[PDB]
Amino acid sequence: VYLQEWDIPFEQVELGEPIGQGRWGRVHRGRWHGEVAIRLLEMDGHNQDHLKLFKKEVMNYRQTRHENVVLFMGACMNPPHLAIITSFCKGRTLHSFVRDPKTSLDINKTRQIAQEIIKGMGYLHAKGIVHKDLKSKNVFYDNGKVVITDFGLFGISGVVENQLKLSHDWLCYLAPEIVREMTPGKDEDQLPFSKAADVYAFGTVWYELQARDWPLKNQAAEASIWQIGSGEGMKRVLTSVSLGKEVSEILSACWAFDLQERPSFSLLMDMLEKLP
Amino acid sequence: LELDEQQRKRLEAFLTQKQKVGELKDDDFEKISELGAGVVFKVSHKPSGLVMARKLIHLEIKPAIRNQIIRELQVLHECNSPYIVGFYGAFYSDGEISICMEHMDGGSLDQVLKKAGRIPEQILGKVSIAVIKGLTYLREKHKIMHRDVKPSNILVNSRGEIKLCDFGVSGQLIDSMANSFVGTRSYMSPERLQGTHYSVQSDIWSMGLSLVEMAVGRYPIPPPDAKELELMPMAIFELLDYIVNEPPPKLPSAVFSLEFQDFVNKCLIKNPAERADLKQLMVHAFIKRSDAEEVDFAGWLCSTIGLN
Ligand SMILES: Nc1ncnc2c1ncn2[C@@H]1O[C@H](COP(=O)(O)OP(=O)(O)NP(=O)(O)O)[C@@H](O)[C@H]1O
Ligand SMILES: Nc1ncnc2c1ncn2[C@@H]1O[C@H](COP(=O)(O)OP(=O)(O)NP(=O)(O)O)[C@@H](O)[C@H]1O
């Protein structure tokens, strides 16, 4: 991918200030004239298969366009160096947005935001793309509009010991199928992400819309792992403070221990419609 | 606090040596070799020839919480007892937190265990005494619990002392770093794993599970096979689910005395309400025995590993 292979006309793009690191390279702000976000990756693997599968995923993301999914624009690969360019999201992450004092959430605003996210996810699922990293920090809210970022990205095999280190915010969004398979020396690419695992993560985002916090208070990751993968922890939290029956019905559906009993996103649109 | 005289004279010596070296900065230290990683390195301090141990941990985050961490850790200057490693100082450098502590000649009982293969009952009695004394000291004097007891954090010297490292003094450092790691083994109590409020009770469990491992030379869960025990590949969630939903380990009945077997059985009760506390453990038969015994520890240590 020389980026001249993409439908967005490209002369030059300039790097700006960095805006955060993570397991998957460093994300800079940049100007395409509009601003964009540029993720710089490096492929340790250096194995033809990894770049073949990378090429597969980045070509698939070319086919996407939807007002609730961040616009994928380009990708270029001068191996081992790679870059993924997406539209820059003005506004605040949904994560920092519910946690604001000044912010005013209500029985309505929550349902509207939730239906936006579902349309975005519903599109992505129709085209057979699994997000694999839906969470509150990868959804953006600028006035009316809601945008999902950082989708598909867990499929890649770039640079990231014999321990594990798992952030608490991430664990809360993970379904039990996944955390049972976690173990040191196992890569994220081998974990069983799926459409059901995505709707489970939607379960946690909806809880965050209700409670403006994690469903489990920060604690040792081993504790979270047992509570998540036993299903006990999510059953106990559903007990501990209740919200409303119709609200709680979608939460209980999304967090369902057996993945096959979880609703699709199309169905979830209807459930969110028949609400207060 | 049953503070002996020879102990109080070696505490004074190191407290007054503490201000001799004074405050610091960065280029005062110099590398020696690899102690290990979970990183701590053996170090020479150039103002005072004594060699100390510096532990570096990599944390890029916002400097505001970095300052809160440094001020919470300075309470370690008040923590001084014959069963807790001598603390020198804490400072920020290059976004790499460094803790300067006593160097322990023999390293960690994890290292001890690998070289020793197995640990005899006679001597496990003395380490057990040290831990209960340390924990009551910790719970009584500053009202904290340890939250991370395991063999790699118990340290031994040729001077014959036993003291524990890496206890949980700072809450911010716990929520910001310590929580995110999971190893290949778990020493966490069954009531912490289900996320209820825990107490030092949880620490009693950790000590018990650690004692089994050292006594038989193998990490005890899942329990060894029946013929494997006489001679002497599992994912992390199956480990945690065993601890919560299966019987606890026990020492083999042919080899160790009742008092030892009963000590660990009381430490390993699943319900922390029925598990022994420290008051009960300090007066237990096994403790009264080993406290009054006569072991030359320094000799065992130096002939196990080859020091002097
Ligand atoms: N398209 C985008 N527009 C604006 N900000 C973005 C975009 N993509 C990522 N960011 C921000 O860039 C920072 C780093 O993102 P990211 O690398 O995804 O880290 P993370 O989501 O917090 N966890 P991880 O995926 O492991 O790195 C975060 O502050 C994101 O909100
Ligand atoms: N003060 C010390 N003196 C001597 N060896 C030490 C000291 N502190 C740590 N070590 C050694 O450092 C190694 C790793 O210890 P540590 O940094 O605590 O990580 P860990 O115990 O392996 N895992 P964790 O306890 O979760 O950090 C072990 O081999 C210890 O013996």
Ligand SMILES: O=C(NOC[C@H](O)CO)c1ccc(F)c(F)c1Nc1ccc(I)cc1F
């Ligand atoms: O040492 C600690 N954790 O080890 C885990 C590794 O850092 C992971 O790489 C630790 C955790 C919580 C806390 F509050 C502390 F003060 C800690 N350090 C620490 C505390 C007292 C002494 I006397 C010596 C020490 F070193």
Ligand SMILES: [Mg+2]
């Ligand atoms: Mg991401």
